[PDB]
C-alpha cells in the first residue's frame, strides 16, 4: 500500500487534473509526456527529442 500510494500522488506523472473546460479534461487525459522515471529532463533534453 505504501508503494502504490507513493506512485499515486507523489510521482511526477500523476498531477492535479485541469478542470477549466471539458476540452482541458480531454487534452490532459490524452497527454503524452517524455519525463518522469526513466525519461528525460528539461535541462538534459537537447534538440533531436
In the complex with DNA, which residue's Cβ is closer, 9 or 39?
39
List residues near DNA by CB under 7 A: 38-41, 43-46
Phi, psi (5° rounding) for residue 2? -65, -50
Q: How far is the CB of 15 from DNA (least distance, A)?
A: 19
Inter-residue contact 34 to 45 (CB < 8 Å)? yes
CB 17 within 8 A of CB 28: yes
Nearer to DNA, 18 or 34 (CB): 34
Shortest separation between residue 45's beta carbon and DNA, angstroms: 7
Amino acid at each position: 500500500s505504501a508503494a502504490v500510494k507513493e506512485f499515486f500522488g507523489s510521482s511526477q506523472l500523476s498531477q492535479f487534473m485541469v478542470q477549466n473546460n471539458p476540452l482541458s479534461e480531454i487534452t490532459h487525459k490524452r497527454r503524452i509526456s517524455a519525463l518522469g522515471p526513466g525519461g528525460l529532463t528539461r535541462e538534459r533534453a537537447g534538440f533531436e527529442v
